[PDB]
Amino acid sequence: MNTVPFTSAPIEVTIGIDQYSFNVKENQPFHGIKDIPIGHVHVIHFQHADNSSMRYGYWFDCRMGNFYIQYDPKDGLYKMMEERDGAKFENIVHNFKERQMMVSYPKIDEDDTWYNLTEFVQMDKIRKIVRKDENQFSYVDSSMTTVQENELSDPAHSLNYTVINFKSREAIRPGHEMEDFLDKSYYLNTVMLQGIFKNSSNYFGELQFAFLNAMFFGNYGSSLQWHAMIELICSSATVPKHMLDKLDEILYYQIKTLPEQYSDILLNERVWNICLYSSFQKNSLHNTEKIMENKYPELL
Amino acid sequence: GAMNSSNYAELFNNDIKLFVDDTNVYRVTVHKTFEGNVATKAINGCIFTLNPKTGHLFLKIIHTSVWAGQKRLSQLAKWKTAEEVSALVRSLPKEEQPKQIIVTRKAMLDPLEVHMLDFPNIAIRPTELRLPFSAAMSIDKLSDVVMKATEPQMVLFNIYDDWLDRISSYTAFSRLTLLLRALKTNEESAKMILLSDPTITIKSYHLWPSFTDEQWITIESQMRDLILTEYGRKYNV
Asked: Where in the cell is it found (chain B)?
């Protein structure tokens, strides 16, 4: 069970840790988050009370180093940093714990929600989508654009999601125009799975990461990527049986976790109606179709 | 974006463009079977690909053999149209290739865009105009070459005959659209108007009769009268 200490909390802020969130008051004696489960990526995220604009946050994995948060009054945000001195860090955490200045990661023993949302998500893949190689952790915010959004403008601050475009030479073999457009199995299985992702686990990891950036930061380009990766599977007549069964589980937990009040902006009517009711896989996502019909029958 | 009444002069500028109409590609007669079910029998069709500035018509005849053993023919028809338009563009010298292709029906947009991925600088556009190119098979000489075809064939016409010697492209297109709108609304009456006087003939190398400038005004007037009558009936107004 690992710890992310905070130097201080000089500005009033809502702090998220995965699917949980806590309000901290200006200059409240808050010194961090303890009992963070080992074995998963985590995201620690922030929304300032005085500017509900720019949700921002940090993806990290406590197995990769000792990380803490410190407010920067110049750049006006909570920053993640690595402490390289193991003994200084252990001594900081033990003191803050002794003074009970830390909130406990509030996991219910029964509750597999975070595992279910991050099953395929790996820190090493996050660090290739979010390029800042001198840090072991990854910054994301509401405003960062994707490589695909930038093609259609600062490359260093981009989300380098895999570009998916149904009307592209990559998607459409010369001589198989109609076949490849109406059945994307070639594009899914040869170009994306065998070619780029290497396996379905890396594909699911990117899909799950795109969803979590859409949900936690309202990142519009992440939402586009999540829907494109769903639509590429649902629009393929030929998908391995294990991939369809896993996709149904992935999407079920994503729809279950989504705030009820955000379904209007985070869910694309066209993609979901097409995926559940028209596509090749219309009958392959039983769990997802049932939660969508009971939670968001308006969208459909 | 979409071609409409606001950007109509763009048709007659010096940027090569083609209209593509796919409404006569897949043609059927619906009939009863011996068992009293319904079946279709395909007949020969055509892609209507027209340069509105020059009058050059690329009539690609679609022989019924292309449908043999295929499913979802109304869907395939859009993709076959896009395949043949793409083949036509690649067959043209670079300086003759269009800068824009305008499809008369929005369902042609995705099929043509995917077939033309190799031509990213050719714009594929819809139109808000309701163009009467479905009536192309009311032109006797175009109907005759489609129905007689025994294999896939491309036939080149000038749909304006020699009109551009006397009138602008704008006026030639307006005359063509009026003739086709008349033929589409009341084919029998339109064809009566065009041939009633036996002294005015169709040259062997033409589609329409050899009207003088004065006779075209009379004809055009008779076509407008035909269209308004039919309209009063359609709507009871």
From this structure: Nucleus
Range of the domain at A180: 144-300
Given phi > 0 = left and psi -120 to 50 = alpha, else beta, which region is B60? beta
Q: Which residue of B has its CA nearest to A167?
A: B114
On whether the CB atoms of residues A113 and A103 are closer than 8 A, the answer is no
Taking an 8 Å cut-off on Cβ atoms, the answer to whether B110 and A168 are in contact is no
Pick among B89, B110, B117 to test the A interface (most A CBs inside 10 A):
B117
The set of residues, in sequence order, having a beta carbon less than 8 Å from that of A14 and lying 6+ positions away, is A21, A22, A23, A24, A46, A47, A49
Chain B stretch 25-84, residues whose beta carbon is closer than 8 A to a beta carbon of chain A = 75-76, 79, 82-83
Nearest to A207, CA basis, from A156, A236, A249, A155: A249
Give yes or no: residues B14 and B86 share one domain: yes
Q: Are residues A202 and A251 in the same domain?
A: yes
Q: At CA A29, angle to CA A25 and CA A33, rounded to 5? A: 90
How far apart are alpha carbons B200 and B210 in whole angstroms?
6
Method: X-ray
Residue B32 burial (CB < 10 Å; 0-12/13-18/19+)?
exposed
Minimal-distance CA residue of chain B relative to A181: B114
CB burial of residue B235 (10 Å; 0-12, 13-18, 19+) = exposed
Number of residues written out for chain B: 237
Residue A257: burial class (beta carbons within 10 Å; 0-12, 13-18, 19+): middle
Of A167, A178, A182, Cβ closest to residue B113:
A167
Look up the domain containing B70 and give its range: 9-163
Q: Which residues on chain B are in Cβ contact (under 8 Å) with A177? A: 79, 82-83, 111, 114-115
Could A178 and B117 be called an inter-chain contact, meaning their C-beta atoms sit closer than 8 Å? no
Instruction: Sheet containing B153-158: give its strands across.
Output: B123-125, B100-103, B17-21, B45-50, B56-62, B153-158
Q: Distance between CA A106 and CA A20 in Å, rounded?
A: 8
Look at residues A128, A143, A158 and tell me which one is the last residue of a structural domain.
A143
* Final residue of a structural domain among B108, B142, B163: B163
The rounded distance, in Å, linking the Cα atoms of B48 and B145 is 13
Which chain B residue lies closest to A172 (C-alpha atoms)? Answer: B114
| Residues A181, B115: C-beta atoms closer than 8 Å | no
Check chain A for breaks (C–N over 2.5 Å) and list the residue before each, or none: 152
Strand partners, A42: A60
d(CA B168, CA B149): 34
Spatial distance between the Cα atoms of A161 and A209, rounded to a whole number of angstroms: 10
Shortest Cα distance from B220 to chain A (angstroms)?
43
What are the Cα distances from residue B187, in Å, to A116, B183, B190, B226, B237? 66, 4, 5, 10, 22
Split into its structural domains, chain A has a count of 2
